[PDB]
Design goal:
The structure is cut from a larger assembly and holds four copies of chain A. With 538 residues, chain A is mainly β. The N and C termini of chain A lie far apart (60 Å). Helix content of chain A is 6%, strand content 28%. Chain A has helices at residues 66-69, 72-81, 178-185, 317-323, 338-341; strands at residues 14-17, 21-32, 41-44, 51-61, 82-103, 110-113, 119-124, 148-150, 152-160, 197-199, 205-210, 216-217, 238-242, 251-255, 290-292, 305-307, 312-314, 325-327, 343-345, 356-358, 372-374, 396-398, 422-424, 441-443, 449-454, 471-487. In chain A, strands 1, 2, 5, 6, 8, 11, 12 and 26 form an eight-stranded mixed sheet that branches. In chain A, strands 3, 4, 7, 9, 10 and 25 form a six-stranded antiparallel sheet that branches. In chain A, strands 13-14 form a two-stranded antiparallel ribbon. Chain A contains five helices and 26 strands. At the A-C interface, loops of A face helix 1 of C.
């Protein structure tokens, strides 16, 4: 029935492919140590960074990656057989809890099971506590179901080091000092305010969640946005040409070629900034296409001066890297820069080799390589009537920076097997269109973070100082996501490109080696990206 | 409603993929000329061949190929997504009939439509008429739905030229002459004995058929039949070893290695004969692994002598090619010889280039490369006791010819997109196991052949000699086959090899060229063979 | 690894004979219906600058 | 749209027409088709939603 000696659950796993739904059940073996010695402590970054925050005696389940949910073949069969997919509903189950005590009886350490020790488990569904989980973090659910998963210590941003800096001395209150105020109005969160469960070995718990999100599109456009037309018909439109290069000139009109027709569809947005590669040795300064210094109006961030035009505190571009936070990749709809923004490793905690994979391959023609703008004649106009031309002029130029504009249509980046699934959309009042250059699906309320700490069992002391019993929790978590899928249909005659393994460069991959080392892809193609062969009529 | 000016049907096409069923609808534009001038005539092969038969004023719909039913992508999606398939039921519809008359009013020829001209359409479901349709014939339904399809003239074998040869003179009856009797008991078939429809432009017809057949398996074995075992456990079996090489010897026993264990599963049958490559210039002599001379006991075939042991007429191996019929490929379960038996062209009626494709790639490990047999010690035994060995002896030998034996298990050849679907199983009393080295599925009663001729409209003549009106039939045929399919399921972790186009050597393929020439694969991999990536636990 | 080789491989080719469609003769006819979902076309002008 | 058009997700479906291919028997077996064309009448009726 129930008790210390009957299991709360069993190992579930596998996948079910279906026409309208895919259901991926996954179970892992996890354990949570005592984090930070059961205490909230101020987290300050070493080196030069002004990030300051709280380190928390808690740890959390991060379920956000694809490769954690799909196996390599479940991924392949997913991307090959389906046009698009999104999650519908997720159900996590935390069970088979076991709490072990760590005692050192001698030089040796012995691990004996202490019943009646609890574990705190808290799912924040309302997101009342800071959501500090980031996509592209190394603490997600392991892709190998037989690897044990160590939960990650939780912590959160609190205040900005250089926005608390100036004149914050506590001698007397300064109400007009704005940096004094930022530090005063900075929050501090404690997870013991919240109602949450305490479980023992016999107890279990589970959580359900219903996604509301966009799709993940697996099909490619074979045609440029502007190239889809019929050369067999002649167009009705003419293009203007200046004739005499002077004031007496006028535009003379001649018909476009059938093979060159104008279009109403602009290129999707992009920023032509590739990020800083200066060979800077500091890893914590901002190296990124767009670095953003958040400072409130009265504040002085790091070393700041007043621009005398606006009389506002501003920074030099070199100092800003200290005070600011980069955003990458910003390339958005430009596929020419795919290689710039994303580079990542699959292998967690492996000091053996880097195995850095970069997104090289995109065959989707709805994403553009370059945009050129051409504003007139190649030679400046003479101010007199008659006359011949003038000083030479730059007719054409590359547009590096393409912002959002009407009639823009593009496709999001192809995602590999190991990417994050979703990203937390900010709780700000205003949002523009959601397109993530890392391919993630921003959601207003993503799955609530599940926090775990180990109940604190005190040790009586004569000195009355805090002494806690050293013990940890291990258990089993089953994450079952239900995925809404769409099978593709096409009238295309020719065969599509399917993400075969034959294109892999390394023969032995997704398999263990002699010593048990699981071989993972070091390349983006070997990660079986989406948007490969399935053609999409423009 | 009905009449000369309303169409009997419409163009149907496409495909429907489903979990349990795939339905491929295909429509073509066909035409049948007047075959052989409305007369049955004796068909005799030029060159040296004894094949003799009838040429018939009829033509027929041949629906047997895969590439006619599936498009290149329908094939790819079929082979990638499904474990096995077989046909369930076929429905053909012959409609939009149009009969045109060919008249030459002058040097010019003009084509005018003659109403009230019939067309004969006969489906032989009972197979009461010779089934002369062969797999690997060039007259099947075109793979391109927009190509017009010329039906093939029908004809059938009647008697064997060298089994009618000797002493067949009609001076007096010889009842003891057996070759005289073969010619007497040879059949002659006429398709005007059979009930069949005569249609005009307003009329249509259709036919239904229900397949009863085996499957077509798309999955491969990754393991040799004999290699599946657990080296972690030590076997209980010992192998014998002769010790002293003489009469006093005996077998001494020692345990197999854990990595080498005996098996009960024999290799599937094969014949190690690769066929004759002598650079013979005669195309109609038998070049094939097994050539079979059918002669009844009393008959003398070509140049024959009496073997004096059995006192029966026999032939020399060189003369037999004249009198006999090869069977290819005979390799059956040996995949080492895949390259030998099958070579074929996709491109019909194209004198431009050969484009000969040969089946090279088979990764299925249930098919064996070689079989070796080893019968004892390496040195002949001395007849005395004591003594040392003897004359040297051949311990091991290759078994070239492996017949059918108990506990044999193997897999049929992987088939490409363009192969025949089925083959007519003979109406003989006895049959062994059905395994076709061309991959076809033998059926007792395959789809009944649909015959078409154009009604003969006479021309009055003073000389009373036979003169017929020159006119032909064009129409539309819709073949709809329903396929029973099985989606694969696997616990395999690693990604499977999917028949991507990326492995194709030619980039422009399955697409028209500048002059409209449809580019077809010249290689076997580019034809997307079955049994590629889907793994089958042995 | 040649990407341009791949673009040519993954380029589609369409044939309109794959699709179910009607074949008509002189006596036959056909018709088609469609329901638009679209914005408007505005025929009125603003006489004032946005900022005036 | 700077040309004033109304972009629609699914505009009216394109109506395709070809003339059935009627073959001509040939000794050389090369493709020879009968030369003929189609004429007809098409009535397009659009219903427009308006605002006075």
């Amino acid at each position: 029935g129930s008790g210390v000696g009957v299991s709360t659950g069993g190992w579930e796993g596998g996948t079910l492919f279906g026409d309208n739904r895919v259901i991926t059940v996954n179970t892992r073996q996890w354990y949570a140590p005592i984090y930070n010695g059961h205490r909230y402590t101020k987290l300050e970054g070493t080196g030069n960074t002004f990030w300051k925050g709280i380190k928390t005696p808690w740890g959390y389940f991060n379920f956000n990656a694809y490769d954690s949910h799909f196996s390599p073949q479940d991924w392949q069969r997913l991307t090959n057989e389906y046009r698009r997919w999104r999650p519908k509903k997720m159900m996590v189950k935390i069970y088979n809890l076991q709490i072990k005590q760590v005692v050192t009886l001698q030089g040796d350490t012995l691990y004996n099971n202490d019943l009646t020790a609890g574990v705190h488990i808290f799912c924040d569904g309302s997101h009342q506590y800071p959501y500090s989980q980031h996509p592209w973090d190394a603490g997600t659910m392991p892709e190998l179901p037989y690897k044990v998963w160590l939960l990650e210590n939780y912590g959160y941003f609190q205040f900005q080091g250089d926005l608390i800096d100036t004149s914050v001395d506590g001698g007397s209150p300064d109400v007009e000092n704005v940096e004094k105020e930022i530090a005063k109005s900075a929050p501090f969160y404690i997870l013991e305010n919240a109602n949450h469960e305490v479980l023992r070995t016999g107890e279990e718990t589970n959580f359900h969640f219903n996604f509301d999100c966009g799709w993940v599109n697996n099909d490619r456009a074979y045609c440029p946005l502007q190239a889809d037309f019929n050369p067999l018909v002649k167009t009705r439109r003419y293009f203007a040409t200046r004739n005499n290069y002077n004031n007496s000139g006028k535009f003379v009109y001649t018909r476009y070629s059938p093979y060159n027709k104008p279009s109403q569809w602009m290129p999707g947005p992009s920023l032509g900034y590739i990020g800083n590669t200066q060979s800077a040795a500091t890893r914590e300064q901002a190296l990124g296409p767009v670095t953003v210094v958040t400072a409130p109006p009265g504040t002085s961030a790091y070393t700041a001066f007043t621009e005398q035009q606006s009389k506002t505190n501003q920074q030099s571009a070199s100092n800003a890297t200290w005070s600011g936070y980069d955003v990458s990749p910003v390339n958005c709809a430009r596929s020419g820069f795919d290689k710039i923004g994303l580079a990542y490793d699959s292998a967690p905690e492996s000091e053996l080799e880097e195995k850095i994979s970069i997104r090289d391959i995109d065959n989707d023609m709805s994403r553009w390589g370059q945009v050129f703008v051409q504003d007139g004649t190649n030679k400046e106009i003479s101010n007199d009537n008659t006359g011949q031309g003038g000083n030479t002029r730059q007719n054409m130029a590359e547009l590096k920076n393409v912002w959002m504009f009407p009639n823009q249509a593009w496709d999001s980046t192809p995602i590999s097997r190991d990417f994050p699934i979703w990203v937390k959309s900010p709780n700000t009042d205003k949002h523009t269109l959601f397109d993530s250059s890392d391919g993630t699906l921003p959601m207003s309320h993503p799955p609530g973070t599940i926090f775990v700490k180990v109940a604190k069992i005190p040790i009586p002391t004569q000195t009355n100082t805090d002494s806690y019993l050293t013990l940890y929790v291990t258990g089993q978590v089953t994450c079952t996501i239900e995925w809404e899928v769409e099978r593709f249909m096409t009238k295309n005659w020719r065969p599509e490109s399917k993400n075969d393994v034959s294109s892999f460069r390394d023969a032995f991959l997704y398999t263990v080696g002699a010593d048990g080392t699981y071989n993972t892809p070091e390349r983006f193609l070997e990660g079986m990206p989406t948007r490969r062969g399935i053609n999409k009529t423009l």
